[PDB]
Amino acid sequence: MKLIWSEESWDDYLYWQETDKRIVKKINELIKDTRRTPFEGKGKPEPLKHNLSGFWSRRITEEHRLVYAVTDDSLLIAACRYHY
């Protein structure tokens, strides 16, 4: 479906490879489920409001949120580290 990785999102994911592998496993599954059902599925996706309007948040861990946006042909990954 085409994954768009932002300058921050790619670095955040890159840091985890040399840091924590489980987080990567969680993000990979969320991405795997997201392309299949973009709005329902794992990580309890909910639409974000005014600050990040037009974006969707899927929980990685109780504090890490995978922020993403959907298009008819692609998926833009805003971040995968910190709280929004």
Partner: protein
């Protein structure tokens, strides 16, 4: 109320309402699956609950839940509707018993296998 009120109007009974209409007063109902997929749960929980829309012998077409770990259910599998609802699933008020016509039991399970329909394993003893 007064006694004359009780003689005139009397007391209303309770006339409780069944929560399992599709069963039609039967403990179990055979049904053919038509849609087998996974659905997301309700308010304080996240998972991928495996359900199956079942067109059963009472002319009804109702959703049912698939308990256990994995299943072999397709678009033309004949299953048996046990009953009982799943709290975190809307419109799902029934269950699919395993170990039946086409719903095979869960493999490798060894504790509670009367539920989920798994045969007694014999480590040759």
């Amino acid at each position: 109320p007064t006694i004359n009120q009780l003689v005139r109007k009397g007391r209303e009974k309770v006339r409780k309402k069944s929560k399992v209409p599709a069963l039609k007063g039967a403990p179990f109902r055979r049904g053919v699956c038509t849609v087998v997929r996974t659905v997301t749960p309700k308010k304080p929980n996240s998972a991928l609950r495996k359900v199956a829309k079942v067109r059963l012998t009472s002319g009804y077409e109702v959703t049912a839940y698939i308990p256990g770990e994995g299943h072999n259910l397709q678009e033309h599998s004949v299953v048996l509707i046990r009953g009982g609802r799943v709290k975190d699933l809307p419109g799902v008020r029934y269950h699919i018993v395993r170990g039946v016509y086409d719903a095979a039991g869960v493999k490798d399970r060894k504790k509670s296998r009367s539920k989920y329909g798994t045969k007694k394993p014999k480590e040759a003893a």
